[PDB]
Homo-oligomer: A and B are copies of this chain.
Amino acid sequence: IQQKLSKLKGEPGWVTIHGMAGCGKSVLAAEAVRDHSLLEGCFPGGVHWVSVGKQDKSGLLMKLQNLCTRLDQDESFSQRLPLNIEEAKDRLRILMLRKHPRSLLILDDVWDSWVLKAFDSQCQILLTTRDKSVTDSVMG
């Protein structure tokens, strides 16, 4: 797995790990990625594991409002939240561009392609899901 992760070579890609809650899906990754130098040069800005789960449209919107807050832990910007998906996309982009560039956001428990629609942008994305085949619905 370590040898396959290095195949990104600093280029975009989609890494997908599959399984269900309670079947050792996170357990696999925990031992597999013990090599720091592997990803040392890939994500200097850190790795964050964020639970997503099965969400509908309004759940994706509430999750996007939560993600905006997550990027401003010290409340240095307005406490107000994005009002719609297009705005949330823009706010997250600006903060990941200027404050959190070179970092990994991990999407735990992806179930619906409606969510992935907002993330399919040919970037280095690690996510967990029911089936490794999810990588086919996205580009990279």
Contacts from A to B (Cβ < 8 Å): 51, 62-63, 66, 69-70, 73-75, 77-80, 84, 86-87, 90-91, 94, 97-98
- Some 8 contacts from A to B, beta carbons below 8 A apart, are A51-B86, A66-B86, A66-B90, A69-B90, A69-B91, A70-B90, A73-B98, A74-B98
Contacts A75-B77, A78-B79: A84 and B62 contacting too (C-beta < 8 A)? yes
Chain B residues lying within 8 Å of A79, measured Cβ to Cβ, are 78, 80
- Give, as a whole number of angstroms, the nearest-CB distance from A99 to chain B: 10
What's the minimum C-beta distance from A92 to chain B, rounded to whole angstroms? 11
Point out the residue from B51, B73, B74, B87 that lies within 8 Å of A66, measured CB to CB: B87
Contacts of A69 in B (CB 8 A): 87, 90-91
Q: Assuming the A-B contacts A69-B87, A69-B90, are A78 and B75 also in contact, with contact meaning beta carbons closer than 8 angstroms in the complex?
A: yes
B66 near A94 with CB under 8 A, answer no
- Additional pairs, 17, CB under 8 Å, beyond known A69-B90, A78-B79: A51-B86, A62-B84, A62-B86, A63-B86, A66-B84, A66-B87, A66-B90, A69-B87, A69-B91, A73-B90, A73-B94, A73-B97, A73-B98, A74-B77, A74-B98, A75-B78, A79-B80
